[PDB]
Symmetry: C2
Subunit: 387 residues, 2 copies
């Protein structure tokens, strides 16, 4: 129709006329519109069929299809793709028709196939690893959650060793320990750590204001990245503030510090092995930084992580929690969906600002400031002090 093409042109121009935050708001609006305009039968069909996207992406990842197509300068027919990748000719045709219909690939007028934005996305190793994670680790736990809750008469999950994960994988270990005994899952998890989210807290964090008159002399630590993974926060901080004095220290487990050496700068950033369930060794640091750490633990273990940092803090020291802060109402699907997944797999939860302050007050901490850096799904650097 001419009406739908005018809608498309119009929303495209609006999207190009705003920033990434405006586009994310428009995308949420398009989603709400779809749900409001669908027939009752469309609703059931949508819930049933959108499940195929992860399964079909997983297949195409297994075949190298997205990485392959991303490197093609000319449209590819189904037959030449089936033959180059080792897939049955009829199976490939059907996968591609489904993929094109959800824009996983683009289909041409002569029934050939080029890459779309999603094809390029699924070719990026860190992002492909997120999709594979969702298939092999998230799906079994979501599949087990409804019968788990029914057998337990619908409890409030607060224990990482008593959730749907234990039923889904027939184990009594928590997810973290169980993952170490699985080599193929660790390999995908290692690639997941190389994906860097953008934007990051340094786009709005007023470091010079939060610094105040704090002195790095003699050799105090400016930034202690606790569970910092590949050290992306450390790297970005030195990049944005190359003249600010103080040690910048990456803290994680020895296996991931070794992997992080491939991409760390030759100097500037220290690598310090540390299990954050043990007392913090670095004393008097200005910023103790926890990005997407505490979300992965129930309140009682998340508190224990904080209590292990408190004894090392001066009056000028701050604990910076960089994590989701969903609002008390109007929370979006990306910050409530995650809440259901980590409940089912880790026994943890997303936390509103109020729940973050209540958790922190138990460790003797007080919220000094909150600096949001994504919208409309809230990620914020929360700055906590003592007293």
């Amino acid at each position: 129709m001419e009406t739908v093409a005018a809608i498309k042109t119009l929303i495209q121009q609006l999207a190009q006329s705003t920033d990434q935050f405006g586009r994310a708001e428009i995308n949420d609006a398009l989603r709400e519109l779809q749900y409001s305009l669908e027939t009752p039968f469309d609703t059931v069909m949508r819930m049933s069929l959108d499940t195929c996207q992860v399964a079909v992406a997983r297949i195409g990842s297994d075949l190298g299809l997205f990485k392959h197509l991303s490197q093609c300068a000319s449209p590819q027919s189904a037959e030449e793709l089936a033959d180059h990748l080792g897939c049955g000719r009829e199976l490939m045709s059907r996968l591609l028709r489904y993929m094109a219909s959800v824009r996983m690939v683009q289909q041409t007028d002569d029934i050939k196939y080029i890459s779309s934005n999603i094809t390029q996305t699924l070719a990026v190793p860190g992002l492909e690893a997120g999709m594979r994670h969702a298939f092999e680790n998230l799906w079994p736990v979501l599949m087990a959650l409804p019968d788990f809750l029914a057998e337990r008469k619908y409890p409030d999950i607060v224990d990482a060793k008593d959730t749907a994960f234990q039923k889904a994988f027939n184990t009594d270990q928590d997810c973290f320990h169980w993952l170490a005994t699985q080599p193929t899952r660790i390999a995908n998890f290692k690639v997941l750590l190389t994906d860097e989210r953008t934007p990051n807290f340094l786009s709005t964090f007023p470091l010079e204001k939060e610094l105040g008159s704090w002195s790095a002399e003699p050799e105090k630590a400016l930034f202690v990245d606790i569970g910092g993974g590949m050290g992306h926060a450390c790297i970005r901080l030195r990049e944005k503030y190359p003249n600010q004095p103080g040690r910048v220290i990456l803290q994680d487990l020895p296996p991931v510090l070794q992997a992080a050496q491939a991409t760390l700068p030759l100097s500037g950033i220290e690598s310090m092995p540390h299990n954050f369930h043990t007392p913090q060794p670095v004393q008097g640091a200005k910023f103790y930084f926890l990005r997407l750490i505490l979300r992965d633990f129930p309140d009682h273990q998340a508190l224990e992580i904080l209590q292990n940092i408190v004894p090392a803090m001066d009056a000028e020291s701050r604990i910076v929690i960089d994590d989701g802060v969903p609002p008390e109402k109007g929370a979006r699907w990306a910050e409530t969906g995650t809440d259901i997944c980590i409940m089912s797999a880790l026994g943890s939860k997303e936390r509103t600002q109020r729940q973050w302050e209540e958790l922190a007050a138990k460790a003797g901490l007080q919220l000094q400031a909150l600096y949001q850096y994504t919208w409309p799904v809230v990620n914020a650097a929360m700055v906590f002090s003592l007293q």
Copy 2:
């Protein structure tokens, strides 16, 4: 933003100004815009989390939440919903926050919850049974499809007894035979038959023109509804053409014929047990009607169903296949997602018009006419004859 409120208002106004087929066109466009405007991270996030909708709908169905909430005139808080339904208060709060973020319920400004269009949909018994089918039957099969295809080096699936269903449910039976041994699944499937798709083929089927000079005397059958389920097509046939003479015969297995006696009209429609894998007993009927039957069977088994009807046809007899007819290009997600699902669970496929004629030709049949009655996802009544 004011911008997204204006987008919603405008697309709502457009959606009300058109028919259901126009609304479906707009919805597909909104989906395409959403996928094209998401960031790479959004894409992975969407694939990871849209899974939760099926799991959470299953939980709400288990608790009776959607049926209960559809009967409430005033908004309900999480605490009172949790108490009435026997669910943890915190668990219920997190379920409701997730559901509200995907319009499964509606959240109010005072953080209470009321029904949405989707809440009402999930309260309808046949549509709830469709969602429950997707959870317990479909996506175990989808969870098994990638490893199944990888182990088998990506074959063309053509056999109902050698597909992802056998690995998902650790059986050697095909899906239909296995289902008959599962009482809880059969019950849900029985409820699923109560849902009547709308619109139906009688909205565009020119009965009188196709009938022509056909004579019902002595006692020929006008309409034989093969695998007709609850008999919805028979009922709507008698409602729209009450004066048309000829028998109208509902053919199905005794279990569903028995369950269909509740909603069948007292007279007009005969109930005749018949297994469509055996020769057709009604001789010389005008219309042999197969709605959403042959889509569930691979080519060789679909052909046997037709080969069993051909020997009972007159020159005036027609076989009417009412089923999906996807296009050769530009097929929609609702007709390609079904294809992947039935491939994985039943070894069957969706069929273009060309594949339907190829299959019918092998039974001695010839396409006479094709009457679409849905758009843009195509369902049509295809009229076949001998020679």
